[PDB]
Amino acid sequence: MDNLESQTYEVFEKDPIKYSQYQQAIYKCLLDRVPEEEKDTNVQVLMVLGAGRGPLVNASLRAAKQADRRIKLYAVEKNPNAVVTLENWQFEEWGSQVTVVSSDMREWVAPEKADIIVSELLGSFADNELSPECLDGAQHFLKDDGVSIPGEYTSFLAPISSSKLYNEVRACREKDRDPEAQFEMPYVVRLHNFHQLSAPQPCFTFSHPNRDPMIDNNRYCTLEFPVEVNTVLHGFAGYFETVLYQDITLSIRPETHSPGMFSWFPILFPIKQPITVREGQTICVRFWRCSNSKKVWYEWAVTAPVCSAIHNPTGRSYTIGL
Amino acid sequence: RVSSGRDLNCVPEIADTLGAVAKQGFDFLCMPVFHPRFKREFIQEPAKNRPGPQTRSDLLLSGRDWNTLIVGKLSPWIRPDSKVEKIRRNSEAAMLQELNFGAYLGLPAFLLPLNQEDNTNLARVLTNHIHTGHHSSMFWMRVPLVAPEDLRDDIIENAPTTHTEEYSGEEKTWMWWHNFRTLCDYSKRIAVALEIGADLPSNHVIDRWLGEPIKAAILPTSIFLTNKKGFPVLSKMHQRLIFRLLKLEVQFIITGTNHHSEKEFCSYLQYLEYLSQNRPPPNAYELFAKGYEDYLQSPLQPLMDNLESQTYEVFEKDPIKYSQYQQAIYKCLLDRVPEEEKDTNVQVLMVLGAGRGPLVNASLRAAKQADRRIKLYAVEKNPNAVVTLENWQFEEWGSQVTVVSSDMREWVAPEKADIIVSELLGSFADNELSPECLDGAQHFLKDDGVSIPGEYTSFLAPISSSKLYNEVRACREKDRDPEAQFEMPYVVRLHNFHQLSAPQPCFTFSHPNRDPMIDNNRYCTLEFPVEVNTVLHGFAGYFETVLYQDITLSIRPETHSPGMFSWFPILFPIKQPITVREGQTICVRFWRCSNSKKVWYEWAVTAPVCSAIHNPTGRSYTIGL
Amino acid sequence: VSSGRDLNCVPEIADTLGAVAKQGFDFLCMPVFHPRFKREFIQEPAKNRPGPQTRSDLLLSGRDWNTLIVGKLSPWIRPDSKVEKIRRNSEAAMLQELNFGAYLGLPAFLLPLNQEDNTNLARVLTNHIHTGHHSSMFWMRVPLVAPEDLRDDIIENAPTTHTEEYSGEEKTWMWWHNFRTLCDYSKRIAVALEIGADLPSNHVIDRWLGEPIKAAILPTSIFLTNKKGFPVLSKMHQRLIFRLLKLEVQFIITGTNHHSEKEFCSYLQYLEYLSQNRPPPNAYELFAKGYEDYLQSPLQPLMDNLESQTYEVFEKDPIKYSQYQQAIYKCLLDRVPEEEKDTNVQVLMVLGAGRGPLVNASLRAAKQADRRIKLYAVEKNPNAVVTLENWQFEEWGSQVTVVSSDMREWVAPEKADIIVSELLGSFADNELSPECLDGAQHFLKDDGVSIPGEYTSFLAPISSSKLYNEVRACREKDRDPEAQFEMPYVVRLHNFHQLSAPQPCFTFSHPNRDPMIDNNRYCTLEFPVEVNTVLHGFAGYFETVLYQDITLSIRPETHSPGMFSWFPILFPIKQPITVREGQTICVRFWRCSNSKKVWYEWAVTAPVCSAIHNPTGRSYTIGL
Amino acid sequence: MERQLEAARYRSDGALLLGASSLSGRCWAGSLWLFKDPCAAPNEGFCSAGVQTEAGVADLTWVGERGILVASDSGAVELWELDENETLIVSKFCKYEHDDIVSTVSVLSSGTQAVSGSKDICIKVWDLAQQVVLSSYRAHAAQVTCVAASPHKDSVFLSCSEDNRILLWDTRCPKPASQIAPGYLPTSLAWHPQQSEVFVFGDENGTVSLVDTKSTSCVLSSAVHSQCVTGLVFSPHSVPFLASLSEDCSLAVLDSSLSELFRSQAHRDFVRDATWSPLNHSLLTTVGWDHQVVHHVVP
Ligand SMILES: Cc1cc(NC(=O)C(=O)N2C[C@@H](C)CC[C@@H]2c2ccc3sc(C4CCN(C)CC4)nc3c2)cnc1N
Ligand SMILES: Cc1cc(NC(=O)C(=O)N2C[C@@H](C)CC[C@@H]2c2ccc3sc(C4CCN(C)CC4)nc3c2)cnc1N
Ligand SMILES: Cc1cc(NC(=O)C(=O)N2C[C@@H](C)CC[C@@H]2c2ccc3sc(C4CCN(C)CC4)nc3c2)cnc1N
Ligand SMILES: CSC[C@H]1O[C@@H](n2cnc3c(N)ncnc32)[C@H](O)[C@@H]1O
Ligand SMILES: CSC[C@H]1O[C@@H](n2cnc3c(N)ncnc32)[C@H](O)[C@@H]1O
Ligand SMILES: CSC[C@H]1O[C@@H](n2cnc3c(N)ncnc32)[C@H](O)[C@@H]1O
């Protein structure tokens, strides 16, 4: 929905580990798709959907030469302020090997179908930037045997105590809106002074390409977190894992964290009223991914040991713009 | 008499059926809007594209009829919390369809059932719907008193109904409601349609629903016993229940077929009508208070605000209280002036806070009933009432009475007083600042004089009432703290609520207060044992007062002065409701605080859990000195 | 007529109330303290004058005080005196009498404006209003013509200037407007307009258009005595009385009985007669009379699915469907010649059918014209598709095909000869008829017809402090305090003043062949104003061409008569804008949109600038 | 005729009985029809008998040759006797004893009694001759989905409900109900014809399972349909085939090991009832809410 500013992209690019992983994934997929003898006769159409200022483009190039295969490149971007940087690069450095396409991938009527599509549309909660819908729209121009990098992703949740962060959220009340809207919306934050109350568990998973004829990106998940301590529930931390290609993956989940990678911080889903939890009790939380023609949003509620209210109903406090 | 409706899951011709139930004597009809067996598919071909019409037309009735006579019903095949994903999504679409259609028709109420523990997705969908158009439409939740599982016949060989004691489990259905109710964030458009079965459970299971927004009671034909004539009747316990439900003025719904087929469906209804007429006729207090049932009002402040005329008028329209005041004055007169001195010793008797002078006429009638000499003063700071007082005085009382238009804390009286009579009590006794007023007016009392009343005491009791909690919640105003309404009391005739523990005395004041170190501030701590599971929403407040020796007044339910409707109870709410399990004790704390200008109360619950401190620094509620 | 009697003399309150009750009046205006009973508050000895200071409240019942007695401020009270002592004393006395009228719970209290400066009067009354949020209304006695400009020219050395004074002749209104402004437009403050012998220029009278006049005060002096001795009024006074009756103001009688032959019921009966002898209350007019100056949010049939009774009131409007039928009929005769009547069938699609009055109209037109038609009824509201399919099965048969989808979505089987729409709001395109028809256009034959083929919105500046206050009261929690001013309202305008002739704002044509389709608009309108007034908003209307010379309109000039399907729309402005005679009001309007929303912005740029209203649709968007 | 065909039962001599409901439109009623020509159905003009009921029909079953037992939306069980000429259909009785929609019925081995299940959660035992309820059983906790009388025992029958319970009954016993991992809800019941030891049940998830009451163990099950299984009917064949009907609008014919032999998509709406022709045992008649009456040749 929003066009990102320059230094935002700058901090995105200032993360080598992640692009090293993307390059390796592209490289392995290249070796799998084009056999050794055909390297010079079969060129691969490789589209970077959501290119930004084109670190994925340079990564695709370095992978093409590291693997020694032929590729024709497309860099799709709906942010024209970044298309500026992209076309400057292209004219100066990439040449006509790369084609810069300034449009939404849900709109673009591409000339030729794709061998590989590379995306970067993940948030701290994986699908919270609507990567599923974007790739679903961009899917039709993929070859009936093509590859999406990443091919899979999955969100993770864990209940947390942190009266500190609860007070920080409480202080986010603004004039001219519901006094409790701040509790019905997530925040990206490097969690620090907090207490994880149960092991993270997977919430929502998406696979691309999604061949399924009955595509429905809505979700209703229920998570039961055993708690072996006395504490007070204030919110839920959220992380993600993603499979770029086979055994190349990324993660901000504390257990499986990709080391040295600072592209994402955890997300936080708060709750209005804190909930006491005694040792041995189980926290049952419910999550929905909901949508219409224009918006996507999450709702959530704690149902055990006690019931909370349903948070952000009808996306009244938080919607993600399609 | 009774407002009633008829429940049916079969309606062949909507017009004919409505005419039939109209001639049977019912006020409304509950019916399905789509055919109950007409399951529909939304996702998957081919039945997805099934050709309409999907139900019967809206032209079949008038907008009048839809708005006033037809309660919609959710088709029973819809299961939004199914374990099957397909049935989940399909029931979601179908629930949206039927609800939006009931709104299209503009129905006054729509029925949805709670018949299991988990209705999380049902609540999610209904909440989503409610937040699409700020409509009026009410939503009645069909909740059984006893779950069908705990009601089944014990005729399964390898699944025996345990005949054991399960206190909490027997209440499980309420739990259902309370969870659903909570997920929907206490929506005022969501109420209870409590369903009643053959076997009635323990009285505590029934009492769980005290304070819950019951709009409808559902009676099946099965639970009707057949009496000697063949009529339908109910057990004595069922009748005790029906009386309790009638005081809440709920609508009654009939479900089931005609098992007493000798008669017609007017028989059940007529049993009900008979019961309602054969109810103890309304005593004078009840009719007055019935209009104010659970109606919230800000506490009057006769000190800071000058009261309007009709306010005094309702104060005076209470004989019992002034009879008591007259008797108290009379006894004090006999005690103070002996028999022989009756003609030689006149008593200076001052009515501090006279209003329009009912206490003056009472002092006069007492003076002649007792046969003693009195000189009278009527003090009042409200000049709009001083008008009435001086008109009376010129016309009737003469110079026997002296009307003094000033604050009693100010007035430099000419001669010291033998008796001082006050009326400065609120529903919480001292909440109109009678202590400070009398403390200021004390110095001009003789060193052996009497104050009528001589003593008073406030009383508190924890109460569950999600109804009144929602009423308070709806008092949020713009341009102030969103939670100010919870940090201030309200005067209200409590009606639909649950007393959770016996009232206990909070603050007491004695007049005259000779104490050299006068401090009207107070810090009290009250422990209320609770022998039930419930949810604390607030604290009811009452008072007792000693006018003179054995003449007293009280609105406390146990010691209530009978026939007296001068005061209603006060209510101190709390922001967040607090669960209380059977056996636990509610520890609440109360402060009476003050400065040069204001007086106010603060309060907090410290057990079983801690609340926040309410109205700190009187930030939300102060009583003006 | 609802009526009351004004008296400055009441010897026995009971007897006087009984007399005025038998005379036929609905209420009595009387003083609560004796009018000549001046009181002292500061200085001894009269400070300590012994009461009673007035008569008791027990003399009536609370019902009587609440419904029958309008209080009156004693005339010796002068809060804006040039003398400091009289200032402070009148302050205390005004507080006394007002607090007493509130103690009695009076439904209204009268206070006079009879000079330019009532600043301290307003200060005290404002202070009082902000002491208990009571109901009590306050009527300001304002003369149409100041007593100075009404005196007899019989002073030798002070001649009434016989010159033309346009602004000065309005001065009394100014009084009100200043007082009214200092009290911050309190809804508890209204006008009791007093009427004299000489009526001024009609612009002086028109100044009060749009003002919250609750009462009109008629003295006995201005009543002409006819041949019999009756009381009557001039022809001009009668024109006035009719104008005042449309606003449904209460009428008050003041003065003594000069026509002493009769009883005070004579004056009242003249009025009663007049009120009965006006055009009898229509069905149309009585329907709309309940909605007079009643605000309602604009419906959004695209984004919201309309309720049943909403459609019901849409259908209960014959004239409009008669026009639609005639338009279809003429188009049929034009398209299919006489010889081909049986060989050429016309595909005729009702886009936005609702409960299908347009379908029945298409059928009646087909048989009235005698031609062949195949019908489609498209509707995205499934709750109405229910009604449609029930009709179709029962009555229309397979001639009609009910299509339950959005016209922007539907992949129609065969292209259309005619498309019939009903997607107009009070401001024409405000229900997004252009976008819907633009989407539904592709399945139209390359030579087909759209009914309506054209529409156009209209705007006109209006003064109405009444409606401005009604909007002001729409402030809600949890949103911008001024959002209510940045959104339009559908309302049967009633008590208001049109300040310039309506002018066209936005026009749309269908089919729109244009390769560069852009439904956005930037319009500028200049409205000459020939009066002094205060701009509070803009009324909005529409015209639409269904076919050739068959059109619909709610524009007051070209109004389709007897049609009550739409009310006018109102675009308010946050701050009212003064406009002197001769000045020109320059308003700017934008129709803006993206993929999801459509909305209007607007601003006044002359005689002064306003802010831009509803920027980025922050306060009002129309859902696509 | 009403659009939604609910039941279709073949008589021993080859005559076809049909039960239809109207689930939309102004009138929500039902009707019974008898076709001595099976290929002439559904056309009303070419019928041997027909009758209009006050209310719709949920389930339906023969009573020998002249009796027709109907479970009506009214909450009533209606018994319709056939005419001496087999031209008219007459209501022998109609009793309102259930409190809610009677959803399922079946006739016992003796043919003088029947069992009914309703949405009022109760099961009822009926003496068809005396025309009264003998036993009223509130054994379930949710609405009774299906009741299937045992073919070879009078006092025994099966029932299944939305309380996820499948009860095997025996009115001789004092606690007649007997319950037999809790999967998805049971929706249809079918005794095996020759072996009164075993039966089959379909669930709401589209899985059909085979149970042996003696072994009280789920020996086998198969995922036949993508949606709820609304009916299960064995063939009279010497080694009997099994027909399965679903809301996915398909018909599936299965062997003794629950493998898919036949499958028909001919219906475009729900499939309600299915009976084999006792004349040509390889012919199978199905009905549905698309008002189709299909005849299926089964290899
Ligand atoms: C590749 C990728 C990366 C991410 N990652 C994140 O989002 C994230 O975890 N972090 C936290 C940390 C690492 C810093 C950048 C970024 C962030 C988050 C939230 C805001 S809010 C804001 C403001 C925007 C407005 N301007 C005026 C001020 C800054 N910047 C930011 C930046 C998400 N998605 C994709 N695809
Ligand atoms: C003698 C005595 C009596 C009382 N009693 C009460 O207070 C009280 O229990 N009740 C409730 C019931 C009996 C009715 C009168 C009164 C009441 C309460 C709260 C408001 S709030 C309001 C509004 C004020 C503003 N106007 C414009 C509308 C009414 N009236 C009222 C009336 C207290 N103290 C003393 N000394
Ligand atoms: C054919 C057509 C007609 C119209 N006409 C109008 O819009 C209109 O002038 N009037 C005013 C008057 C005649 C009454 C109906 C309607 C109206 C306006 C505003 C609201 S707001 C509301 C509420 C909605 C929510 N529910 C719960 C209560 C009523 N109803 C209404 C009704 C517009 N467009 C099209 N296409
Ligand atoms: C690198 S963060 C994601 C990037 O992808 C871009 N993007 C997101 N969605 C789309 C889309 N649908 N079409 C094109 N670019 C997109 C964003 O503008 C950003 O540059
Ligand atoms: C009958 S309710 C209490 C009455 O006492 C009056 N009152 C309260 N406080 C004072 C005071 N300090 N001096 C005089 N009258 C008082 C009030 O104005 C009211 O009429
Ligand atoms: C009779 S008021 C206008 C009618 O047209 C319907 N309508 C409005 N926009 C569309 C659209 N785009 N497609 C179909 N019906 C529409 C509305 O739901 C309403 O019934």
Author numbering:
A (entry chain A): 316 to 637
B (entry chain A): 13 to 637
C (entry chain C): 14 to 637
D (entry chain B): 27 to 206, 210 to 328
What sentences appear in the manuscript?
Due to its involvement in these critical functions, PRMT5 is considered an essential gene. Targeting MTAP-null cancer cells via selective inhibition of the PRMT5·MTA complex can improve tolerability relative to nonselective PRMT5 inhibitors8−11 by limiting inhibition of PRMT5 in normal cells.
Shifting focus to the area of the binding pocket around the benzothiazole, we hypothesized that electrostatic interactions with polar side chains could lead to increased potency. Glu320 sits toward the edge of the pocket and is solvent exposed in a position that suggested it could be reached with an appropriate substitution off the 2-position of the benzothiazole ring. A crystal structure of 51 shows that the N-methylpiperidine engages Glu320 in a salt bridge with a distance between the acid of Glu320 and the N of the piperidine of 3.9 Å, consistent with the distances observed between ion-paired amino acid side chains in proteins. For example, addition of piperidine to the benzothiazole in TNG908 to give 51 increased potency by 14-fold in MTAP-null cells and by 30-fold in MTAP WT cells (MTAP-null GI50 = 100 nM and 7 nM and MTAP WT GI50 = 1600 nM and 53 nM, respectively for TNG908 and 51), decreasing selectivity by only 2-fold. Bicyclic compounds all achieved good potency (HAP1 MTAP-null GI50 = 5, 2, and 4 nM, respectively) but they had poor selectivity (9, 6, and 8-fold selectivity vs MTAP WT, respectively), unlike the matched molecular pairs in the unsubstituted benzothiazole series where they had excellent selectivity (46-, 35-, and 39-fold selectivity vs MTAP WT, respectively).
